[PDB]
């Protein structure tokens, strides 16, 4: 479970900003804002966020849109 | 010294095998090898490969 993040290396052009994207996703997944779509088989919230990045439903742009729509609704 | 040794022994060809020249599919050689009457050397035998 979440061995290599090679799919995000193929999708997102850089892998060093991928760590900041994954931390920004995982803090929102562990505090609140969106329910986990991946069930907790044997993993924690950061591994679920990394698997959601590996599936290809989140990147820097989607998290920027999410941050702007969370700052707009306040 | 262990994995290379094992993959060198199980893939080394040698003559005078037990039950020579059998025509057989892919996974059925593990079916034949585990019980009895088959060596791992098994030279010059044409079988199925995908």
């Amino acid at each position: 479970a979440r061995v290599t993040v090679q799919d995000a290396v193929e999708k997102i052009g850089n892998r060093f900003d991928l760590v900041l994207v994954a931390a920004r996703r995982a803090r929102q997944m562990q505090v609140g804002g969106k329910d986990p779509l991946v069930p907790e088989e044997n993993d924690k919230t950061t591994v679920i966020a990394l698997r959601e990045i590996e599936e290809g439903l989140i990147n820097n742009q989607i998290l920027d849109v999410r941050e702007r729509q969370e700052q707009q609704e306040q | 010294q262990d994995v290379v040794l094992g993959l060198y022994y199980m893939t080394r060809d040698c003559v005078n095998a037990k039950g020579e020249g059998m025509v057989l599919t892919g996974p059925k050689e593990a079916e034949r090898l585990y019980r009895s009457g088959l060596a791992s050397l098994h030279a010059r035998v044409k079988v199925r490969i995908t």
Partner: protein, 221 residues
């Protein structure tokens, strides 16, 4: 004295040809016991109804080429060894073959009986026939176990068990006090005649009724 009975999941896989059963948890040094028991109880001695003898009309000698086949006179033998047709009522029956035209031999074209039940029409016996008609052949099946290399003249290996590969994996368990235990994962593949869990049940009945001569006195509660 005391032991433990496992209560977890048993079968969660694709029920067509894959089989991965889980046995957690057990006792230390016993996954190998059940593995070595089921392997030699299901692999070497298991009844079946596979193809024993194939007699084609023509040359009664080696590799039988140029007798109504084009690409290979030996691949049809492997295709008939891969086919498993169960027999319910009788013991030994002989089937024929009828094919017309150029194309792959359809398994549904074989004339079946009440006890003859083909497992799948998609099995191709022969592929390339460059002739307007084909030559019939006798296919005799038996109910004998003991898959051995055949050395009996007048020819292919009669298959005993419908499975093709058996292996087992031993994994540690996460019980509270006992750590080094056995989680038996049996990876075994079946061609698709009978479902694999009933084959595991048949090996279990072999191991059960094999040992009923020693559990007579005293009674096992």
């Amino acid at each position: 004295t005391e032991f433990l009975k496992p209560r977890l999941v048993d079968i969660e896989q694709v029920s067509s040809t894959h089989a991965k059963v889980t046995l957690e948890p057990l006792e230390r040094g016993f996954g190998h016991t059940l593995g070595n028991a089921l392997r030699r109880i299901l692999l070497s001695s298991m009844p079946g109804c596979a193809v024993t003898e194939v007699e084609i009309d023509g040359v009664l000698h080696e590799y039988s080429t140029k007798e109504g086949v084009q690409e290979d006179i030996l691949e049809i033998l492997l295709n008939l060894k891969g086919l498993a047709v169960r027999v319910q009522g009788k013991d030994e029956v002989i089937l024929t073959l009828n094919k017309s035209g150029i194309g792959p031999v359809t398994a549904a074209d074989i004339t079946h009986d009440g006890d003859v039940e083909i497992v799948k029409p998609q099995h191709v016996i022969c592929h390339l026939t460059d002739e307007n008609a084909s030559i019939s052949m006798r296919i005799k099946v038996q109910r004998g176990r003991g898959y051995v290399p055949a050395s009996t003249r007048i020819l292919v290996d009669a298959c005993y068990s419908p499975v093709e590969r058996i292996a087992y994996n031993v994994e540690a368990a996460r019980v509270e006090q006992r750590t080094d235990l056995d989680k038996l994962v049996i990876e075994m593949e079946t061609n698709g005649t009978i479902d694999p869990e009933e084959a595991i049940r048949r090996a279990a009945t072999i191991l059960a009724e094999q040992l009923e001569a020693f559990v007579d006195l005293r009674d096992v509660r």
